[PDB]
Design a binder for this molecule. Structure first.
Ligand SMILES: Nc1ncnc2c1ncn2[C@@H]1O[C@H](COP(=O)(O)OP(=O)(O)OP(=O)(O)O)[C@@H](O)[C@H]1O
Ligand SMILES: Nc1ncnc2c1ncn2[C@@H]1O[C@H](COP(=O)(O)OP(=O)(O)OP(=O)(O)O)[C@@H](O)[C@H]1O
Ligand SMILES: Nc1ncnc2c1ncn2[C@@H]1O[C@H](COP(=O)(O)OP(=O)(O)OP(=O)(O)O)[C@@H](O)[C@H]1O
Ligand SMILES: Nc1ncnc2c1ncn2[C@@H]1O[C@H](COP(=O)(O)OP(=O)(O)OP(=O)(O)O)[C@@H](O)[C@H]1O
Ligand SMILES: Nc1ncnc2c1ncn2[C@@H]1O[C@H](COP(=O)(O)OP(=O)(O)OP(=O)(O)O)[C@@H](O)[C@H]1O
Ligand SMILES: Nc1ncnc2c1ncn2[C@@H]1O[C@H](COP(=O)(O)OP(=O)(O)OP(=O)(O)O)[C@@H](O)[C@H]1O
Ligand SMILES: [Mg+2]
Ligand SMILES: [Mg+2]
Ligand SMILES: [Mg+2]
Ligand SMILES: [Mg+2]
Ligand SMILES: [Mg+2]
Ligand SMILES: [Mg+2]
Lengths: 239, 263, 250, 264, 250, 244
């Protein structure tokens, strides 16, 4: 039952005392943070929102507001992922070196503010995952707590827009980020502007490509003014 | 009158029954009944029963079983053999009634053995439909479900696969699986509301009209996929899913007459 | 041989016949036969005949009638009752021979009654019913292939002819399905309505209570604005379900 | 009767007249009259007149002048100011008639000054007021007889594109101006330039209401934004697409085509 | 500083007022106010008022009345005749203000007649209200949008009208006279279009023209309804039914 | 000037030349020229030459050979190797110049060897070759009018362009990369899109379509994607700007 799973989560937090919660602003880390606040109190919880080049300022700013809005003391940290050459040169194992810096930075903060653990929200401790929370358990328990506000856009590292072996730069990331942001603003929340030097190759879910046709000309000019020479749509669609 | 009066009628009927067996489909209506029964009578006085059958997907049974447990109910699966009844097997126009009889015979048998005073279902405006007795309309169901914190249920209206077949066509495991696989494939492309109507060698696909503009990119893949499942011709119904429900005043009048001409 | 030798062969055969009846479909081949008959024998000595029937559209008929007039021929329409022949009515693979037999029988009656020496059709080189009725395919006898037809038509200044290939409506019904006046009309009215929307190439395949519409796949995107009207229009023609074949044309 | 008799009637009427002024639009009908007039009376006895005006495109006028020259006729262009008549300028339901009145008046003036015996048009009361002669109609030509004789005469060049007075883009009672006429003409030309040869930009003050064949509306969506901006820069505040399309109800099922005709 | 400090300011202002009349729209803000008013003053000391009018739909009124009941408040509906004010009727750029003037006038009449010490609305930190002395307690306690959601969550509030309504006058050009008939026809058109799956829509009124505003991303799927939408809005009184090429809020 | 006047100028020039070799593409312009030459000089005094090459399609070549015979000309096929020239093969902005040199050079050899007085092509208004339509001031509208008057109706209506334009400047043309682009465009034309470019970007194909056609193309996305991948592209894409 959900009530049995919440007790597992309630009990696990009680044993840990002071915690540092890795907070993404999504529904999962939102549930963890609110449950931590409810059982341990605001003086014993630290919300950490990681800012970095591989994810959007909109997600960072949204998460920072939501943690404060949920009543947690919130702290920002900036990771410089591109200082790592594996990330900078986008190898197939970049993902690994990024996570190392992420968890290292939160492990440093937790040891430095007296936390007993770093917590995350995977379906470090994933107490939701240890308590056998499914996606549906997350929804019911959050509604029960009166939670309705969280970032519903699933973010993924911008390195996925670049081929392996391509050097990431500050300029490349900003160009892809602005292009994807413009496209979401047209009504397409799921999109990728895959970077191929002078070509942008846009990925949309195949079910959305018919609706996109009204925007062809505007997207072409906009992504050209961001620096692409050719703006194209992948016939295979998203993934 | 207000929702609170409708809720109070519901609480009162539940307490009077003491022990209930709740037929739980996973839709929003039976969820509210199940939630209310647990809350007023307690978990030891409620048995959630989910009927699994050949006419419905294992996906709906599994989803329903998990939701009943997640709400804190003891839930037991039971399997009905609808195709053992000749009216159902040959899909007569009253097949629905013998299916419902076989359904309710099974839940009354379960109720007698677990000491329940009644079988509850989620019918709204031998079994008891407390939502209907308390004058719940569809909007009342949604308001109390929101008030109660209920957010998980199957939001796609489930329907017996017999409706995909003409009256008089014999249902088989082969033709049922053929219809379900076609519907599962179409859902897997992003069309959660769809019907693959069976007409022997013709597949007639029904979509919400608002989605048919999106579908064209899949024409060739759906054609070839449904052919390998056994159809010779794969077609899209021009009237779409629930023809006439979206139409202007004159053409809903016209399509309703067309729909009555084949009564 | 040269186009000129083939043209000369055709001219001499026409001269020998003096008076002719041309089976005129409006297509390029009988257009060439008809124009040549006119040029060699004169308008007074040529009767152009367009057959109207239940298995083909009135639009194809009226178009041929106007085209023959435009070439300067006296044209007469005749009606065939193909469904009175049970071999046609029962839609077997050999129905088309009995259709052509009835067709050539009517043209021989017309030719006999106006004193023509032959019935002419536009068969070209690369048919039993034609020879058994004694009709002449002078383009085929003169070794005209399709490019010879185009070459002589260009030389004659012919530029207007019916470019739409006609097909008997019986292809809308599966083999063994009985043709009736009502089910033929139902398919014809349906296809005529769909063409009127801007789809000149279309098929309404008959499957009793199901209409299965075939469109060129490149046109299906345009069709969506018409879904509801086509659905209701074809139900009012008697179908229970109106469907679009996901496979497209043929 | 027979085609040969209809041609003879036409030839004789031409001979009885001896000198004519032929109203030449460039269409097939006035092309046939002009060719027959030349053949019977000779170029010195035929004057081709092409009327230019604000209610039609410059392309069609220039096209007609060249076509008459191609037939070997002495041709005169004349310009009409239809907007000087208040019925035309204020677009009343009878505006068309006063347009023809001004048209036939100007051609009669030309014919009287060059010594023609009649004005000829290619029609198959403004003519009975002016004295205009429709010799094809007096000889009972139908449309196919016009086609037969044009082919028989070896005519192959004429304007096959249907022209329509731009006054039809304006509601009755709306004042035509040089500006709003040019505004409508510029809009339709832009839409034709995108690949839409059958189109109307109906004028509704600050609104443009575009009529397209419905089979084209799906492809048109790729141009929405460019059309919106282009027609706004021509002076419309709102650029809209008629949901009923070009010639509403002509492509509707029987029930809803009679309900669309009832509403109108 | 903190939500708690802001909540405290609001609670004290509520206590100081003892008895209040709450202007309840059904939205999140006035939902927060009404819940705070009920929790602090008790159900006998708060009157929830939902304004019904021609410039808004019966559906939003029915939702707000029902929502106020769900919160456990005594709620009373009142009807405003916005069209009685000629500034509103002739839709000048100042129509909005004369509407709010009439609104706050009616709420003061109710509050004075039930013995309330103030009318409360749900204005937050982010006009004709101050020209009536109505109190925006969330605004005085410096509630921003995040504070409203933060406190609503803490109070267990999850149910409110999430669809922001908009006065139907925005469908009419400045200088256009609003009538009972043209308001109702614009409202029925938008309702019919919402019923097709377009919750964000505008039917702009231009006498005999309806100019429909849709999000551009929806227009590809909308084509399947063109003819039905065309005939439906003509049956409502439009002579022409059109789609704005610029989309929603062009 | 009237069409009859320009045609008369054309007739006189042809008579003046007596014997000509006509560079025949199958398009409307060279079709008009070829027909006028045949009509004025007779089949014995006209040689139609159709150039086959690696930069233009075998289909357009076969169509012209058929069209020349149908027009009543003795027609000769000749094969050019544009790629044997390094300027062409290395695809610079000067490639066109060497291509035209090689083209007119081969036609001059043919014309000199059969005794023609000139090579004729179909240039219209707006080298060692005569463009009689341009000298007689034919515009596109005059070409069509005279073509109709002559009863000409059959010609290749899709405007041809050297395949080298599918590759960026500085990209070396190969037999393989050309064939890959030629197969991709042929597949696309076979679906009903006679105007298309498959622009080559190594592992990316960038398809250009007339924008008016892009709405209908969507029913083909997956098949074009799969087909152009088996031809060797990794990503198959559509240019949002459309054709040209
Ligand atoms: N900027 C970030 N800052 C802090 N924590 C993060 C951040 N991004 C990801 N995480 C942490 O890592 C966990 C898993 O990350 P991820 O976003 O990939 O999965 P998720 O399903 O979206 O979880 P969530 O719903 O919490 O966002 C989050 O629950 C969260 O604890
Ligand atoms: N497989 C099933 N297993 C158990 N109970 C079922 C099942 N299907 C239907 N029911 C029960 O019988 C009632 C009838 O459900 P039905 O599908 O006919 O309408 P419904 O609106 O979908 O109901 P609901 O919202 O409760 O799912 C359900 O409310 C539920 O109580
Ligand atoms: N409705 C018809 N009316 C008169 N003759 C017809 C008709 N249909 C076919 N024919 C005659 O029979 C001949 C064969 O017609 P068929 O359609 O099988 O071949 P075709 O290639 O289309 O020839 P064509 O170019 O003349 O149309 C025609 O050339 C014509 O002479
Ligand atoms: N600009 C114009 N200039 C001179 N005459 C004109 C002009 N427009 C129309 N006409 C003349 O008035 C007659 C009627 O023209 P109308 O457009 O009404 O019919 P039509 O069927 O198109 O005739 P046509 O084939 O000659 O174009 C024409 O036949 C022609 O004689
Ligand atoms: N029909 C109405 N009846 C009663 N009060 C209303 C009504 N409409 C608006 N209001 C009141 O006026 C205040 C502001 O109105 P408005 O809708 O413009 O802003 P809002 O930000 O949407 O507020 P809310 O979230 O409460 O709906 C509302 O918070 C509410 O107190
Ligand atoms: N494969 C080719 N073979 C023979 N001649 C050619 C060929 N391609 C071009 N030409 C000749 O050179 C001239 C210029 O051709 P080009 O394609 O560049 O322009 P064009 O407008 O298409 O002319 P056309 O209508 O005749 O094809 C042609 O008219 C023709 O005379
Ligand atoms: Mg997340
Ligand atoms: Mg259900
Ligand atoms: Mg034929
Ligand atoms: Mg005309
Ligand atoms: Mg609101
Ligand atoms: Mg060419």
């Amino acid at each position: 039952t959900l009530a049995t799973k919440k007790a597992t989560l309630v009990a696990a937090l009680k044993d840990l005392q002071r915690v540092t919660v890795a907070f993404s602003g999504g529904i999962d880390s939102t549930l963890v943070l609110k449950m931590a606040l409810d059982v341990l109190g605001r003086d014993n919880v630290t919300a950490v929102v990681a800012n970095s080049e591989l994810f959007t300022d909109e997600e960072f700013d949204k998460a920072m507001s939501l943690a404060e809005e949920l009543g947690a003391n919130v702290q920002g940290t900036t990771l410089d992922y591109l200082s790592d050459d594996h990330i900078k040169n986008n190898t197939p194992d970049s993902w690994y070196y990024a996570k190392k810096m992420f968890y290292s930075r939160l492990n440093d903060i937790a040891a430095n503010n007296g936390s007993a653990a770093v917590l995350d929200g995977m379906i470090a401790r994933s107490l939701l995952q240890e308590a056998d929370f499914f996606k549906t358990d997350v929804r019911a328990l959050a509604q029960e707590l009166g939670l309705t506000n969280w970032n519903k856009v699933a973010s993924c590292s911008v390195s996925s827009r670049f081929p392996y072996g391509t050097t990431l730069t500050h300029d490349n990331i900003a160009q892809v980020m602005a292009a994807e942001k413009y496209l979401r603003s047209l009504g397409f929340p799921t999109v990728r502007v895959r970077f191929h030097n002078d070509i942008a190759r846009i990925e949309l879910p195949e079910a959305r490509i018919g609706d996109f046709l009204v925007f062809n000309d505007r997207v072409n000019r906009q992504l050209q003014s961001l620096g692409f020479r050719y703006v194209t749509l992948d016939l295979g669609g998203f993934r």
